[PDB]
């Protein structure tokens, strides 16, 4: 309707000006010697979610105006569905909270409320928005999201539909949200002593932010818990359907991530700690890593997209399939996937094992909004196939 | 359409955040000893226009959803008219320029561009938006506005329709725009010497901002030029129609303003300058002023609104007329007109003759966005009558 589109504009406009204010405050009110990297590592876990939901608004727009008819296969109410403006304005509104909380971290108010609470105000109000019991703030759709999350986070005993699989593949590109929540727990165990001045943005002494209980231990577990839940979900689909080719090949592309991060974590804890003879010892686990990324890339480009098949494919479109529901321009980007799958797998190796600590908050902070854009491309070119198949 | 409503939201959101930034910069980046009053007296002539156009968006909304059918009597194309969102987003966009220019006056950029140009950038880009020759930025409607302004500012030889009269009555509440343009000419003749530091916001020495050529002279002419053009326009309607009661009574309510400001200006220049014996000498010209304001108020409440007539009026609505097109709530406010007509006439006496120089930039700056709201109420309760009569 007109009010929802007006709220889309209102939240996008407030988001644009507060983003410009964020850039201007980061440039002309830069910190003297305090580390900005804990602030980036906490607020990245909100920025990626908001960018995911804004790109999901573009995703629902693309499915709406291409004959995808996503309400048939998501198992939704076709009379009362969620249009793309509703996702746009939810993404905008959460962006307003994110920008206001980060401006509160920059421009600190009076000394009664220190600067550390504002990230908890951000994430707590996002959760309180999510589990609002009976209010009108998306009662129908968000409780479907909560039941979906309950069925996804408990992978056994629940038969997977499509929306279960779809959002379990959405956690595959939003693993950094769980990483940043775990880092927020680690940082607030590090700096619960308030001093009433700076909870966030500590001094140039990092106070051992890389040291914790079970170094490269449970951090890899919080890393791999989306890949693990999607692996067990695909195994439950194997227990139900008992069809080999769409399942065990699909289970392999997350078992590869489960192996790769674990082997890179043992590399990371056997490089700094213990015998540092691993110059050729884990050189095989970068060729295995290359195979484990090309495996997911070929799976991403051949069967969930169906994107080039010489078996009953149209001759003049080697790029695309036999029949395509997207229009002629905005082509089926194999390039934006062949680069950003590599970017995602470099990043997922970097921001968990901390191979490069000097670049662990720049490479990850650049490549994670690019891997969200890769997942944005994935949504178009997977639901051009699920409607067809 | 959806894109225009999205732009309404976008411009309203950017306007809201830049307004909050304006308040925060005026509070926490307050001037030490520099006078803020030239800055207020220049930017009030943009703020009143933008508030007028935003309230005109609410006006077209009110005429659209009450059966007014304003396209019949404005002599417009009913297939291609201007909806209320278009006025909302034009008002929003000009608000974006106004807030950006005033933030440029607060947060000054580098020394190549001084702070004085930004008001000329504001008003020059507003004019360049207005007289855009062939671009798509409202080609159809704004050239109708330009031909309307050419027919209004040249009152003889042009037969008045309704839109001519309507916008000539819109200059009756936007006289402060002409005052602030004249003050901008006076201030830039005062401070054309740049010094590359502060064109706007001079030091506590005002450098004789009340002294000019023909003190209380041509300033009263620029004051009374909307009332004068509406007076001659009503006289041309008397030359055409030759009907006495809707015309000479209508001519009287602007001849009263033409007399009142002139007599108050001679009071102002015979109080500070010359013999200051006018303690009872012009005391009759505040009772005459009271009669000259009640004359316009009774004209505003009896015949252009028709708002209470015991001759063939409905019995249970003493507040309203026999048949009313607005719905039951949001009543026909005689109170918001009986107060704000007085507020407008206090203000129009203050900001031209400068009776109270210490309150000449606070009383005027408060009461002029209230007189624009009075004109906003006038638009509803005049076009509830012109459709009926």
Swiss-Prot record, chains A, B:
GO biological process entries: cellular response to phosphate starvation; intracellular phosphate ion homeostasis; phosphate ion transmembrane transport; phosphate ion transport; response to virus
Entry similarity comment: Belongs to the SYG1 (TC 2.A.94) family.
Reactions it catalyzes: phosphate(in) = phosphate(out)
Recorded consequence of changing residue 165 to A: Increases phosphate efflux
Residue spans that sit within the membrane without traversing it, per the record: 137-154
Outcome of mutating residue 230 to A/C: Decreases phosphate efflux
Domain EXS residue range list: 210-389
Record note on what altering residue 13 to F does: Monomeric; decreases phosphate efflux
Species of the source: Homo sapiens (Human)
Effect of residue 341 to A/C/L: Decreases phosphate efflux
MF-aspect GO terms: efflux transmembrane transporter activity; inositol hexakisphosphate binding; phosphate transmembrane transporter activity; virus receptor activity
Keywords, in A-Z order: Cell membrane, Disease variant, Membrane, Phosphoprotein, Transmembrane, Transmembrane helix
Residues of the full protein shown: 230 to 618 of 696
Variant or mutagenesis effect after changing residue 304 to A: Decreases phosphate efflux
GO CC terms: plasma membrane
Role played: Inorganic ion transporter that mediates phosphate ion export across plasma membrane. Plays a major role in phosphate homeostasis, preventing intracellular phosphate accumulation and possible calcium phosphate precipitation, ultimately preserving calcium signaling. Binds inositol hexakisphosphate (Ins6P) and similar inositol polyphosphates, such as 5-diphospho-inositol pentakisphosphate (5-InsP7), which are important intracellular signaling molecules involved in regulation of phosphate flux.
Bilayer topology: Multi-pass membrane protein
Record protein name field: Solute carrier family 53 member 1
Positions contributing to phosphate binding: 169, 172, 253-254, 341, 374-375
Result for mutant: residue 254 to F: Decreases phosphate efflux
Site (Gating residue for phosphate transport): 344
Subcellular localization, as worded in the UniProt entry: Cell membrane
Phenotype upon changing residue 371 to A: Decreases phosphate efflux
Extracellular side, ranges: 31-35, 109-114, 194-200, 275-277, 357-358
Stated consequence of mutating residue 375 to A: Decreases phosphate efflux
Cytoplasmic side: 68-80, 155-159, 243, 306-324
């Amino acid at each position: 309707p007109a009010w929802t589109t007006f709220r889309v504009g209102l939240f996008c406009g407030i988001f644009i000006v507060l983003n410009i204010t964020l850039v201007l405050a980061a440039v002309f009110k830069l910190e003297t010697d305090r580390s900005i990297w804990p602030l980036i590592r906490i607020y990245r876990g909100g920025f990626l979610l908001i960018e995911f939901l804004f790109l999901l608004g573009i995703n629902t727009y693309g499915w709406r105006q291409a004959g995808v008819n996503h309400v048939l296969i998501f198992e939704l109410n076709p009379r009362s569905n969620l249009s793309h403006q509703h996702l746009f304005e939810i993404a905008g509104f959460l962006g307003i909270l994110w920008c206001l909380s980060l401006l509160a971290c920059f421009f600190a108010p009076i000394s009664v409320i220190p600067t550390y609470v504002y990230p908890l105000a951000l994430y707590g109000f996002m959760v309180f928005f999510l589990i609002n019991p009976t209010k009108t703030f998306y009662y129908k759709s968000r409780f479907w999201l909560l039941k979906l999350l309950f069925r996804v986070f408990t992978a056994p005993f629940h038969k997977v539909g499509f929306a279960d699989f779809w959002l379990a593949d959405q956690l595959n590109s939003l693993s950094v949200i769980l990483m940043d929540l775990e880092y927020m727990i680690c940082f607030y165990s590090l700096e619960l002593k308030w001093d009433e001045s700076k909870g966030l943005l500590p001094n140039n002494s990092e106070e051992s932010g890389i040291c914790h209980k079970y170094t490269y231990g449970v951090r890899a577990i919080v890393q791999c818990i989306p890949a693990w839940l999607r692996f067990i979900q695909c195994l439950r689909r194997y227990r139900d359907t008992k069809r080999a080719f769409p399942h065990l090949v699909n289970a392999g592309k997350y078992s590869t991530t489960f192996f790769m991060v674990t082997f890179a974590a043992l590399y990371s804890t056997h490089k700094e700690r213990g015998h540092s003879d691993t110059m050729v010892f884990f050189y095989l686990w970068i060729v295995f890593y290359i195979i484990s990324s090309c495996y997911t890339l070929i799976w991403d480009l051949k069967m969930d997209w169906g994107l080039f098949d010489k078996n009953a494919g149209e001759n003049t479109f080697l790029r695309e399939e036999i029949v395509y529901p997207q229009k002629a321009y905005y082509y089926c980007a194999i390039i934006e996937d062949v680069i950003l799958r590599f970017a995602w797998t470099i990043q997922i190796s970097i921001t968990s094992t901390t191979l490069l600590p000097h670049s662990g908050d720049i490479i990850a902070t650049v490549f994670a909004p690019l891997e969200v854009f890769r997942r944005f491309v994935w949504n178009f070119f997977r639901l051009e196939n699920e409607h067809l198949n």
